[PDB]
């Protein structure tokens, strides 16, 4: 629309939550098209991904691995003040695949550190989308040091199935998976690095075998299980966003299944339905509709059951609520 | 359904028939639902994968690697009475991803030799879909020993294609694609072993490269080809079932198509048509349906070709019938 | 149709031209069936890969890798007058996804040095489709050579979207990408060979590793970049066809969308829409059709990143026109 239909439409500041919560927001959109804005500060720093202390240098936004979901509807503009600050060592950016333009808006906010910057865009394509820093020269380094997250756009009227019926959650969950290439020593021991720009020819040599050392969910091995399970009741409608900036995932919900899944994760691109696994290609988001019937433990895992329990990629669900034996029982338990 | 209206339902007891094969059902549901079962005993056993010789210790269901097709319709209960007789050394289980609760029944079936139970769960919805052994703590070890299989739950009025037309399979054959990781001596030699557990520590090590030693069908390098060929004739309809438990393939019918390809293997998702090489990723099943318009043998391929024609993942179709010259012809043959 | 209708049919020869252009072609069907005519010549040549000066013994259809895109329309009959010059030392063949019997073909083009054949088939169903070289017994060895390439069936009344509207692009691309396997020294230097056979059994050993040294665009990393970068304008409509014959890929393009993706390649598939990252199994080719609306570079690449970047899987679009502040404008430039 005019120039002073931008100029005049409302600014709202949101408050992000870190993965795998997500902040407020509203299915169904409220009011007109809206300016909604976002800040996030890059970190750079030390952290430990898993049990035998291994460390990874990350390039967090916000400083989170995966990046913080950021929600709003089709049509809205998302406008993000992205500051690098002086105490981190290299230039950042950010590439929206949402966004149209300037590699994602990565051509516009490349940003040294002691920079901000404040990138605007209109968000004209509905569905779950990935973002990720990519700096010319050094995109895949900086995706796998975890500089990425995803952005849900969903339709001002909210999601709806294949038929046109609504399709209204109760909670969402965003789990964001992440391959790290760790470097090792000629004795199998993970290499430790004091500044990250100390790593970066160990690390890419890892890069180039494809072989991800560790493929975890929220940053770390078991991030997402124990006292951390993401949680649900039995007749709960879950939605359960997923990304993987740079590699192939298989989602499967153990006990589960996904009722309606935008394995694209466009909603313009009707959803299949009762999914046993899903696929989401390396640089794309999904998504996943479930409504749970049973209570107890459910294994969240990407379906190369290697990298879920040899190197890192299973979550939980934990749910409560009554059992249903019409839709599964023992007849007779383990038994000599 | 109550306990009662369950227990009032007539049953149906299904004999199991070794892959490619399928056991004798009805593609349209004959009657209301019904309690199917089945038995399967596992069984602990040497398979040889190649001509090399080389072995694996396999863990399969009713002998066989995939563990065979069974077959219900929408909303008929399965009752499975699993056996791990006391010759075996590990305990195992199974894990229906067709099933709602505890881990697709992977929870209620954790038996040590010697042992046996049986779960009864509702088929409610269609679709191909894998089942497999899921010990916790050593999960992929079981599916990688080829302890998988897959279910295929019918629709009660049969298939249909994306406009509600019935589609009709004159035959049905599964083909189960295992990935195998066969640890290796200094001199580049396979190992053998005299119990399970020997391998266990040098296979973990093989499967964290996410590099299979070999991909095959049926369980080994050549099981479906030559004598082993499967067959059909020009006009005939045939269902190819394709399974994969722990990583992804792409099946392609060298010579044909697949007509219709339910992708993701779940009938209430519209299928793909006239395709040339679909995929399934790994923790699903996929159903393709074609009809063979020319006789001759046609391969049958994962189509990385390197997995299939250096790593074992292909099979063949002899058909029989009239060669179609309007379909192709050679105009001249080769020659100087 | 019976052997006197088809040879009443009207020719038409066509001359190919090197991807990632396209030969002249109508997208609505002028006329009644036709047998569309083509003739190329296989080439066994060095080619060079990289910056380095990295060798690799192609094996190629028409002299290029990948081989040119042949465009005929659904129904017509495409005539392949296949050539094998006695400068050659293998025998080769050719396998067309697009057609049904022997192979798609193979089985009826199996040509030694010095030899020729004529092909012809029916194009029955529409789409984009891979050919391939597969000479029994070395059929991936000529394939990640660089021995395939991909055609496209036009429905005869031009493409449209999944609700009957047309779809008519100004432009389109073929963009082959291509797995190599390049052995290494003592040193990790890339090894070259006198002649094709000598590199036999080092390839096949990196083979086996199913991790490609290199993944690239039109036969070399950079291919299409700089002068050779591809081209468009705001406005501009732009078909995108991608195949990869022997391993799987996931095309983004930088900055836009696949507005539609047929990413089975399969025009009787409705398209999904909005996608930010397709997938293309290995043995399929795909396309996608975009509306450019900003001006600038964009990156097209397969979106694991280390592959784009570091094996060599980017291309770059440089696009003419207005840039558009309202789709996304730099609030605040990158400052301290
Ligand atoms: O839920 N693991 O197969
Ligand atoms: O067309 N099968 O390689
Ligand atoms: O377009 N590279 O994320
Ligand atoms: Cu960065
Ligand atoms: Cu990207
Ligand atoms: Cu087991
Ligand atoms: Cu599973
Ligand atoms: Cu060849
Ligand atoms: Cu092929």
Redo the contacts between chains.
Sequence with gaps: ?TAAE?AALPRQKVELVDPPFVHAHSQVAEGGPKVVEFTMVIEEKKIVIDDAGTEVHAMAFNGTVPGPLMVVHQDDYL?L?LINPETNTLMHNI?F????????????????P?????????A????V??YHC?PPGM??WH??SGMNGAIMVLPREGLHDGKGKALTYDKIYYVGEQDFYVPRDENGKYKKYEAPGDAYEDT?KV?????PTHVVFNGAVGALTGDKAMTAAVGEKVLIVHSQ????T?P?L????GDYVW???????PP????????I?????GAAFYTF??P????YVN?????????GAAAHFKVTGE??????????????
């Design positions: 629309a931008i406008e003040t590439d695949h949402a966004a149209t333009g300037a590699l994602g808006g990565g051509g516009l906010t490349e940003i040294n002691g920079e901000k910057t404040i990138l605007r865009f209109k004209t394509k509905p569905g989308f990935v990519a995109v895949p995706v796998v890419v890069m180039r075998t494809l072989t900036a740079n590699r192939d298989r499967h153990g006990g589960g299944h394995a694209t994760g466009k909603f313009n691109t299949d339905v009762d999914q046993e696994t899903w696929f290609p390396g640089g794309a988001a019937q049973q107890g433990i459910y294994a379906h190369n059951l290697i990298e879920a329990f040899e190197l059992w249903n034996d019409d839709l599964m029982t023992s007849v007779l338990a383990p038994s000599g």
